[PDB]
């Protein structure tokens, strides 16, 4: 028994929430002052203490959770938008969940969190390999589904008063971006790779 789809959805959702907070801190999408240092996967991280920001991120990922359970997510993207609401930088989390079959009883949840820790560490240092963002940026989150992203509209709208829409091309497309790899992992339960798309 045991619902590993739900186990992966859980682990992934917790990691993505921490990684979204860290991206906002490390790229200065919001002032350093709203963040508090915490530890996740035994890595020093930074979480926002602003209540409305925290609820927005929570709501966003709670909506993604049932899609990750079903493995209907190809990519989760944190898009950083400039003051004209155009994408200047994208943190792309590409995801695949292998058929869960040869499960390994040697502390699986402990092993996956060590794998995820390496992603947090890479985000923590990525300011040194990226150009600084211009002032006045905001962010959004994009969810790329494996099926047509209109079958999944009923399934993603999990949270009262938190509707989703189809993204517009201008919210997504960066022309000829520079790709900066950050980290790749593989495990019995999940494979992931993280890279940044930057303006060329």
């Amino acid at each position: 028994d045991l619902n590993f789809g739900q186990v992966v959805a859980d682990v992934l959702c917790e990691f993505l929430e921490v990684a979204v907070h860290l991206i906002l801190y490390v790229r200065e999408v919001y002032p350093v002052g709203i963040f508090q240092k915490r530890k996740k996967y035994n890595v020093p991280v930074q979480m926002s203490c602003h209540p409305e920001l925290n609820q927005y991120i929570q709501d966003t990922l709670h909506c993604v959770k049932p899609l990750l359970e079903k493995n209907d997510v190809e990519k989760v993207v944190v898009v950083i938008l400039d003051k004209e609401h155009r994408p200047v930088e994208k943190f792309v989390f590409e995801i695949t969940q292998p058929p869960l079959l040869s499960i390994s009883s040697d502390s699986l949840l402990s092993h996956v969190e060590q794998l995820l820790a390496a992603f947090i560490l890479k985000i923590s240092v990525c300011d040194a390999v990226l150009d600084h963002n211009p002032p006045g940026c905001t962010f959004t989150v994009l969810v790329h589904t494996r099926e047509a992203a209109t079958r999944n509209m009923e399934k993603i709208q999990v949270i009262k008063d938190f509707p989703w829409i189809l993204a517009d091309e201008q919210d997504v497309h960066m022309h000829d971006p520079r790709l900066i790899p950050l980290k790749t992992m593989t495990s019995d339960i999940l494979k992931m790779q993280l890279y940044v798309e930057e303006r060329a």
Binding site: Y30, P31, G33, I34, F35, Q36, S48, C49, H50, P51, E52, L53, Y56, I57, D59, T60, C63, E74, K75, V77, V92, E94, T96, T138, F139, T140, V141, L142, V143, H144, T145, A148, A149, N152, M153, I156, F162, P163, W164, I165, L166, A167, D168, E169, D171, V172, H173, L179, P181, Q193, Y195
Partner: protein
Amino acid sequence: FIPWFPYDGSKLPLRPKRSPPVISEEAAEDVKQYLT
């Protein structure tokens, strides 16, 4: 390096309809003062 899922304009992604909150200089200072 090669991405697993290159950008494909034929399948647009989903995004939240509402935007995240705008936090002013002023609001950020209060968060720093009281909540951290």
